[PDB]
Symmetry: C3
Subunit: 361 residues, 3 copies
């Protein structure tokens, strides 16, 4: 196992690591290492590019260094820890309010990626099978970019995984909405690279929304688990098992939804995985991130020059920037004389996408 952090002169020798990967969430890897340098400075490491590999060259994680710890010091070395996350994790660092106008969910997501985060088409790709309606207005309020994006994708049942661009040496976010996004198709073993410890758990547009919400129920109705030494095994992969003392579902084919991941100099590579059965009548769907709850009222100013900007439904266009908490040109809201007047905006059942005027101040 190797860890390369760009610009770092200090030798990096991997002691131990713990990793977590899961569909529709950015991965996280806490990597311990030793170095002859007993004073690696956080500034040399934080926000730098990082690459973490399993050596045979087998699989690499590309990302940024989010956290840095100096753990201890000996006579001749020091112990350190770094957190390696993809660049997508950095969307948690920005939380501005915005109203997005006439977009589909993907277009909003692509905007958030490209505008605030400088991501560039090589950094992500959409392979959606379904078609997504334009939404008239979509509000982001009191939500970091990651939460906002993940909520929008989950409500409509789009999911993502990370993949590696061999040439560019970067991680790429790939979005999908159906089973044609699954990667086929390894066949392990039981138990060189193999599978073992297999176990199961079972518990008890539109339209569309009813279809997505049913597939999500089916998702959490059947959890498949197991253990492995395969360095190829990853979220997004559809695998099957040789067996044949393995349960029936694992012989049909299972879709890996998650892995927990580990090694040390005296232990080496083992992973536990979560999974769901392959099926032709449902697909993977992420957990629904709850909507923000809009209690109380928002002040706004009616805009125009100077009678009222009012379209063929009335339906004022209202402006709610006062505190630069609003993204530029994303402050304006179409809502149901006077008009430079201050109004109160309320939200039907706390829903940010059902605003109305309450409300004149």
């Amino acid at each position: 196992h190797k860890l390369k952090i760009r610009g770092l002169q200090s030798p990096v020798d991997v002691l131990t690591f713990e990793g977590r990967e899961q569909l529709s969430t950015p991965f996280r890897y806490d990597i311990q290492f030793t170095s002859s340098d007993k004073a690696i400075a956080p500034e040399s490491v934080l926000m730098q590019d990082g690459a973490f590999s399993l050596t045979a060259a087998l699989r690499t994680l590309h990302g940024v260094i989010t956290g840095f710890k100096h753990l201890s010091s000996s006579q001749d070395e020091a112990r350190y820890e770094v957190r390696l996350e993809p660049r997508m994790a950095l969307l948690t660092r920005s939380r501005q309010n915005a109203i997005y106008q006439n977009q589909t969910v993907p277009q909003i997501v692509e905007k958030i990626l490209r505008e605030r985060h400088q991501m560039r088409g090589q950094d992500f790709v959409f392979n959606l099978k379904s078609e997504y309606p334009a939404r008239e207005q979509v509000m982001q309020y009191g939500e970091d970019d990651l939460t906002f994006v993940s909520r929008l994708l989950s409500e409509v049942g789009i999911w993502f995984r990370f993949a590696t661009d061999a040439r560019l040496k970067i991680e790429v976010i790939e979005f999908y909405d159906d089973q044609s996004g699954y990667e086929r198709g390894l066949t392990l073993p039981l138990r060189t690279e193999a599978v073992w410890g297999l176990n199961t758990a079972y518990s008890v547009s539109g339209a569309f929304y009813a279809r997505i919400r049913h597939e999500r129920y089916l998702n959490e109705q059947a959890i498949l688990k197991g253990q492995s030494t395969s360095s190829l095994l990853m979220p997004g992969l559809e695998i099957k098992v040789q067996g044949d003392d393995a349960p029936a579902v694992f012989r049909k084919g299972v879709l890996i939804t998650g892995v927990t991941t580990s090694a040390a100099r005296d232990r080496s590579y083992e992973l536990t995985f979560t999974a769901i059965p392959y099926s032709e009548r449902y697909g993977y769907r992420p957990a629904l991130i709850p909507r923000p709850v809009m209690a109380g009222t928002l002040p706004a100013r009616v805009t125009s020059d100077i009678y009222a900007h009012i379209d063929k439904d009335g339906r004022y266009r209202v402006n709610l920037d006062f505190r630069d908490t609003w993204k530029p040109g994303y402050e304006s809201l179409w809502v149901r004389l006077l008009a430079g007047t201050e109004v109160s905006i309320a939200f039907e059942e706390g829903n940010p996408d059902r605003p109305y005027i309450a409300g004149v101040k």
Copy 2:
């Protein structure tokens, strides 16, 4: 220890178990077992009846199988787990909005039991000492049936336990509101069946509501704990201790509020219990389940033909079904011309039982 699941041909041999019982909450038992059948299918087990006994025949838990796990497989056997809960636990599976009209808390609770859950008079029994007022309107909004029912009972300080019908072979919910619901009266031992490890912890209509809320404070002011091998020891039982190296409270008499419960083929039966002192000036009271917080507004339609249905307080009768999220005939609300008109319903301090018109759309 025996586990019988109705309809199951596969032999069931109990490996290990962990159980939890507590007043005013449905019990939960995770039971591991081995079987010669290396492919018990979830469909043979989920939603089937289950009975779990301590053998001398000593005590049985009746309920349904909620969860199923295949844990591992050997050459000749497989290891499995099931979750055994009473039928009441299944009230968590239904979450419809409803307004209940002119009922007492017990009548509402009985309705929820009988209507949506097919429970039949043998399945539950009320032995209340206090008298409960009819409530004009009571709203269930964004709450599963279990949460709703438990909240209503707790706000008024009614509690329940489970008991066994020997003849019918079923679990029975028994509701009570005072000390005459306690079952008397075992006397253990210290330490064949006995008690040990005794310990204490002390920390720092109406009317009525002040009386209930005081008794609840007294409930959490004095926690009594201990360990036992008695298979008879259960929530709801009032027991006393022989001693006499046991603290004073345990000699007076204690009411068992909860037990955690365990055995294995190489360990056998032990339980830890929580408890409260017997007293004549207070009784058991469950934890208060918080009210749902009504932020924002609910749309409604004023009904009539066609001027307004309006009684001698005005006070419109309003209808808020649009999305079959409302129980049939439970969609209508009496609230303080025009009238097929759409209004906004708001709630005084977020309370679902204080609605008013805000609010004309």
Copy 3:
């Protein structure tokens, strides 16, 4: 280690203890002891004064006994536990609604201390460097006194620590807002009293509010940790380390923000500490306690005799006591004919300090 609880005849012999101290929060010490008395009664102990010392006389914690446990009994002794907290912790026991009129944050805090809690100038001291504006109205709603006070201090970035009055034998709350509140200046060791196990972690009026919120970001950007046997080491202390195999920050000087603390008869004294670097361009700032979220509306009565109490902004003075949930003379609110009339009070974006009339009942 000695524990004295006022009025207690039963001999107290300290078995083991676990303690937690941290800036801007009341300390907590769970202290186990043995006694020849096999029936110490909770009433002899709860709410009594308690003093806990490290013997050389080295450092004492003064406070009250909040919790009491009888753990076990032998032939000749019994094991007990007590929780020792300062008197400030008792502010969690009172939760009344109140509107404070024309005060600074410190004056409100001093009021809460003196009025409801009988604290007397010897019990606390303010040494603020910054000047704090009078606030016109400040609402406490659905918040215990501790949460309320801590929220107000944190929003403005005031912090506190506890100190001992040698003569009076009491704990004293000391409030500060800058680096001149730090106590200088021990110099340990590495490793009689010393330091070891040093480690770091780094992650990724006004005006004023932007300045406070930036210093708070810097606070959680760099966590310094370590271990020690010093009985002098405490939150509030600025210490430095001899080294010099110790990292650079620890040689500059670090401010102790927190300690976890332990001993036993067979182990004795060790503490882990958290800390932040000394700096001249930022200071310690506590975590921001979130504001209560005001969903729904509050009923109020317009007061006067009898036309309307209305000052030169209009701007009614409104009264919202109905249920003695309001502190005496703290029920009245200045808010934007008729007037003994009942109104509805709403809150702009759920903020308790932005009330307006919605709203006529």
